[PDB]
Amino acid sequence: SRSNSGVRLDGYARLVQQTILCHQNPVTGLLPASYDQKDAWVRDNVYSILAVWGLGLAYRKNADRDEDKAKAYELEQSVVKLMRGLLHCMIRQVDKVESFKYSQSTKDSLHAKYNTKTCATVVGDDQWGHLQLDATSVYLLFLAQMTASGLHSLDEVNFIQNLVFYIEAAYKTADFGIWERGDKTNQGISELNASSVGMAKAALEALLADEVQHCQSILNSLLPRASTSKEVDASLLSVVSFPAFAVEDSQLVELTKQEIITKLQGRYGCCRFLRDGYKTPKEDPNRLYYEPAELKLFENIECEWPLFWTYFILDGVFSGNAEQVQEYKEALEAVLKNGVPLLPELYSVPPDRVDEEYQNPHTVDRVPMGKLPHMWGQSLYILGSLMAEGFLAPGEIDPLNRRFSTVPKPDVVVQVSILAETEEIKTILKDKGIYVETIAEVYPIRVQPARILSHIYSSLGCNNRMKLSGRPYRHMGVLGTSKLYDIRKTIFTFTPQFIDQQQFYLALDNKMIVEMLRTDLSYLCSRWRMTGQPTITFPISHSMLDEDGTSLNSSILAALRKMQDGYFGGARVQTGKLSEFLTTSCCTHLSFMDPGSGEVDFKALVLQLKEQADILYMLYTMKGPDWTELYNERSATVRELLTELYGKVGEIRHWGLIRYISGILRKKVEALDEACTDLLSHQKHLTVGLPPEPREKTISAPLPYEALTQLIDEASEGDMSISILTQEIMVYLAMYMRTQPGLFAEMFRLRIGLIIQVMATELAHSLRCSAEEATEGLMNLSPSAMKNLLHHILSGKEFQGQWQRRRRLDGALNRVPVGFYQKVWKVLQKCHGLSVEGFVLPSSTTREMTPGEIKFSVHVESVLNRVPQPEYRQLLVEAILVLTMLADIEIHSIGSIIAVEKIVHIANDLFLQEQKTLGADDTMLAKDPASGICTLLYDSAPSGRFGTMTYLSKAAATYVQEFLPHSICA
């Protein structure tokens, strides 16, 4: 090997020694960022040791002589030393890991910088924005990979598992990002970056799959966009490619790479993100933050980082390629010291040449500044060279086969065991043909609720010596409660979450349980990427039987018979005894569980209750609010009979009553924070009340269950029977996004109050009735019937007045056209802003929002979609797009903030005159008592000579006539 491969290996040894290993501290093993930046970043240290690890691997695959063994051992032990030093850096902050485990706050996060001479902390928590889930996640990922490569106390194992819990909730934790500045605006605003989420997913996979697939949901929803305030980040290459490989969608990976190439790639590398301005000649060097008005200034002149082209060589090596264009384009290396490449950190447009670069993008000869060499980039450069020259293989750097993520994974067959709670239930199930086994017969396998599984993991990770307290109580979804568990040598199987949660009306409806089971199976068939085959334990309880008790629910039978047939829930299902499923299951072993009016005196007014059960309940709110857990003077309290009333109406299944009792007793869904976190996990915002704006409190970020529940209560303003609707509809939307997320495309802000109003309207026109009696029959809907209404609301299925209904359906669902937000970005260039109901969407937003941001989307949907009425909004949507339509033909720009409502109305006044003349009844067209827009205008089709969009075209042209006196149109 020394003939022609040992000399080149020694050349790379000199490269790594003179670029990386020269700066490693003999006391700590950390690497200072540069001469000026003497501190050691976690992520930079982890990335900078990749070259050393790869060299050691190279040296070892050819280590036969001693000297070669000495070099390989030195390199491998340098890598081990660096990782151990970073460990004591994190170990010294065990009080921060423990605090972030429960309260994921930026003030309780691990520091990014550490003293390279003492493994201590250099700055204060307040001083750097230390929350960077990607640094800890990349450390965990490469700790898993290096160990799987043969690189070697239990206390640090407990600390590492507590770090697993630390980065476990990264799909819902705002971050300061890989660039440790949060959002682009650069005001220290913690933001959810897909880079951190993907790195956390990779670290967890290499090292509980529920939060792993939550991170997967974040990745699918966010890509190709980076985060809320970023169209694209070149750091996404660290997710869709080396080192995370956290995206298993090949199309998504290709789309993200193409977005990076098209938007950020330049002559001297790739810009980190659009309007970055980290080392641009336009920033203020001594000002830490960025004003929202200078972000425009950074456009088209952002610094291009050569570091990202090392990622483009790494993929290309990991995935075989002729991307030998990414190499050969890195001739932009500083010294050819002696001849050391010295990959720069970034290239900045020379200051004088700002105007030329702005105008002519990616064309000016930039200068190198920042760190030189960028050790994070230099290590990746050396690793890619090693890998590309045949001295290394993807399987040596990646012994965990993270690269095989993109390969299509086959559908999984979910084995289900239907277990009888009681033997009588088993007898009924058999009369009907499903042969099952009782929970007693399944012994020695012990069936437990998922609550017990969540509590068991709270004893994982605990060392009281360093004050680490297990894992926080997290709800285990279907993924967690589908593996079999080896606890104290006896196998424990756990039923899904939705079965033991019988505290809200959803569990009483057997159809709901069928629907929850179907959603769980659909989620399992797609998200199970685990060794073994998942096993859903489905016990048929006594509540699952019919009214008589000698027969089983039809819906539950039908579901079980379909599962026996192999298909239910979009999933192939194998039913059988739980004993048969031991050999082909994810039988994980939990080793931590081994031991070792008048008359205001309310003296006698409840006497009227002593049989309609509606009236009995009605009195009971007078006697609750006026008199909830107070006495009744008959060995009874207000709460007690309300619970008795709740049980009675559950037995009679008159759903309006159950909902009301639930509503005034403040029944709350336990897995509701999970529903909100799932809906927000898919990059969909939520608003909770009736539509006028203050009541409708928006949910932009995840909220803890107490807050979420409290936000729901205050959004009803005391008006009952909607606070429960918000939770129920949120749960249904979560299930439908888990199962049929295509239904939720072109939707970005779910207005629950508008949804409820549109369900009431649909119950009013279907089963024609008054809108009000329909608002009351919506109460009397079964939970599964209401879920069906929501399906039909979403998919627009029907059980001269049509176009008003559509305009309503789409507006309530807040459905926007494809490309609508980017089109709004275009008009804001022309006009000075849009005004809806007096609220202004200024053009200054575009000076800090790139068109494809999901932060500009929110800005638009907060000025436009806030409109209470469902249709008025869909018309305001048209008037914007006809404004977008006519902006292209118009050659000039106007200095007015255009009031879209007026264009809607001017079209309204243009609707009376035209229709009256074409000759229509004056009473045929009548105004809306809420919007002042003729009902027939809503009923009008979009296109045509009398189409509503044509009227707005005749309205916008007659609107901008006084603003634009002259209009040399194209």
């Binding site: 051992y73 081990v80 030393k81 070697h152 106390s153 239990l154 360093m466």
Partner: protein, 760 residues
Amino acid sequence: ETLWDKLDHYYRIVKSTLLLYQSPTTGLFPTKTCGGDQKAKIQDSLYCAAGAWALALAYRRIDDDKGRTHELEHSAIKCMRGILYCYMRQADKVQQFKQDPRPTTCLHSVFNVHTGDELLSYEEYGHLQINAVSLYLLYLVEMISSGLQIIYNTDEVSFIQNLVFCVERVYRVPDFGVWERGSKYNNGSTELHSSSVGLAKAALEAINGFNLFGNQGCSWSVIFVDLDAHNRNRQTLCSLLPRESRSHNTDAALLPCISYPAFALDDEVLFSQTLDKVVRKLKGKYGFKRFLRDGYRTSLEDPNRCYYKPAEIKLFDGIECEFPIFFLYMMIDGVFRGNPKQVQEYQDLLTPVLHHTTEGYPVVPKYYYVPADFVEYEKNNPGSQKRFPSNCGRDGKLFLWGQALYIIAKLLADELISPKDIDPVQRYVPLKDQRNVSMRFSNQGPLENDLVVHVALIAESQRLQVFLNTYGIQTQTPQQVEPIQIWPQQELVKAYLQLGINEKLGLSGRPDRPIGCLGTSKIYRILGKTVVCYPIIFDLSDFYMSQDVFLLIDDIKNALQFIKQYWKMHGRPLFLVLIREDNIRGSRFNPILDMLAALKKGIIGGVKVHVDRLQTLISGAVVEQLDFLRISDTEELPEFKSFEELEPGQQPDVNISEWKDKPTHEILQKLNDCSCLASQAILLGILLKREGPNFITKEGTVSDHIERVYRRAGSQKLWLAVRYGAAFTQKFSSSIAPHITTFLVHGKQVTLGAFGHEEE
């Protein structure tokens, strides 16, 4: 009981009573198990890591360890790569300590368990405990030998070398010791302790030539000890051996030295003389007194005053605290030394004094103190009263060092670990095996010493080789040995200056001292060439002693006798007798020829020698490969110069007193009328004082005329002048300081000064 069950018993005790306490961050173990003290002592952590490693050595005998071998071994590495961290952060101090070993330049021996930062300052604590640096190095060798990979990069190897450069010169650095106080008196005084020098002799014997990389190691990972500095430590321990120090005729710290872990003493009679005094004068029912007249946590000790005042030490006679750990060391000594009844005698003594924690795990109380109410009764009849434990474990207090030694002793006694397993480097050499162990024993054995030093007579010039042959001695000029390079010792001192040089840690290299006769007696491979060094006896010097050939012949005999008594390395020593043409000039020829002839006969001074050609003598010999030189910063290899062929009055009349009362230019007058090189030295030496360094002389600067007269009468063998000259020019020899250490290493004290005048 299965082995798993037998060793799960120790894993429960180790994991509860030792590894629970290991710092999650530093790896060091805390001195106080329960409390807010953040002190991790260096010695106690080393003994704690050794205890976890001893359990791993036991779990290595089970293939299904269930992870316990990796954890217990990696806990030991954690503690040892944590002490290294504490020291590596204080490497500004390792450089200062090599250059100026002093109580206030030392590596701190107590650090923050949580952070590794210095906790107590030099004033607050006596940090100069070289037992700790030295046991770090004995344990690093014993653990790296076992398979435990503690040193990871070349910079860690350079720090371990710089740690070695410090541990070599222990004989001349007095310290506080294992007990942190110094002497029995806590006067704040450091003294040489056999225990600290003994552990240093052992670290140096173990670490010489040791790849710190282990099996995955090359030539550039080896540590290199000075055979001469190690000898100076062996000489000091031996001079002081039955005893511990000036102050202690016996200390129980001698037991850790004489036997596990160091197993330092190489004399079986001194081991028995040292152990017997330690057992006889220090043993107790509850343990071994650390030293007689010890005030540690005694009832009569004042808690507030750190320093015992003179004669207080009497108040602690019979009240001395007895440490049960020493019973555990005696049990480990018995397992090693094959006494199956010293293990039982001391196991039987420990079973009673051993407390047990709530879960049944044994607690070795650090000390057993006489309660205050019973102090007088013990003093009256020592051994009568009942002493209360210091830590019962249930208290939440555990002696982590003693907890670790219970695991080592109990495993060794139960034969769940072997003496060989915990002494991978063979520190214990059974008598029957005391034959070929480098730096300790030579082929001849422990008692016999007739070494045949391999002499090579090297002649300065071909002229001298042909002259010497005519008169009977075949010598070889420096050129005739062409591949072999003969170097002055000073050229090896220049090469060694590049050993341990780390600029990242600010380390510099071997201190620039002279290599001596046990290091110039080795063949070295430096930069691809074989280098043999002429002894320091043959180094030219300003001092007038060099001129007497009889002193050279005696220094040659004296050096060869030192090489015989103190060279215990594998090869035969190589003494190169450089002969210079000045040595044979005049009647020096007859004395030199008799030495050279006896060297040819094979005996000069009782030291048998084999004169032979260097090429034959260097042929199958072990060569120390000096691989640290490399190319380093300069792309050129260092430039090393090698010895090359030098190709062609009855009384002073002028008395000082009667001629110094004169200030006259007349002293400069007699200077022209004095043929006496003694009158000239007296006359031209009065003037090095009154007129000055350069008062013009007829000849020139006075400094030049005395150096001419000193040099001239040195040759003319006019010794009164040579001594007036040396004195007047204030000449001192390089060897005065090296010899004054022979006096000190041998327990003697030199006083310089005249009789009837100021002595020092």
